[PDB]
Amino acid sequence: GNPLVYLDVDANGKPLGRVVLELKADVVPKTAENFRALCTGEKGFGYKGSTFHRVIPSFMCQAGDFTNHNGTGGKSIYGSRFPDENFTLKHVGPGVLSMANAGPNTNGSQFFICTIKTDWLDGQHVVFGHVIEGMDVVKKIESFGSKSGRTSKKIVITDCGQLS
Ligand SMILES: O[C@@H]1CO[C@@H]2C[C@H]1Nc1ccccc12
Structure with missing residues (x-):
């Protein structure tokens, strides 16, 4: 079964709500597992507390740089x-x-x-x-x-x- 994970996102400290994502471990197990583990923080580091640092309307929202917070x-x-x-x-x-x-x-x-x-x-x-x-x-x-x-x-x- 594929994981269900979530991101709770705020803007200037104000909650925007929750994004729920299905991770396709059945197609890309290593990539799904990396993301799943970074959501739970179980390796000792992860996404909690980091930012969406690059956000382009009509394109995409980019996040996950939890070390430098700037895309590097x-x-x-x-x-x-x-x-x-x-x-x-x-x-x-x-x-x-x-x-x-x-x-x-x-x-x-x-x-x-x-x-x-x-x-x-x-x-x-x-x-x-x-x-x-x-x-x-x-x-x-x-x-x-x-x-x-x-x-x-x-x-x-x-x-x-992780939700399931
Ligand atoms: O080591 C790689 C390549 O450099 C950084 C860190 C890591 N992933 C990544 C992804 C997108 C942009 C920059 C990076």
């Missing part, structure tokens, strides 16, 4: 980077959960949730899940972004974890 950092539960597992899942529309990277085989912890079909990323970013509920919360996050990616409020993952 993050790390996986395996090491500083891990290979692209596969590209079987595609960026088919809004709600897709996919790995940010810095080129081939540079997955760490940064990730993005799409607010549009980002099919030009197929074959280059590992898709590993989708939004089950809370896409309205993703839209609220999106509303505090801008074309440069700079956010107009501090968007924080106040809490995260």
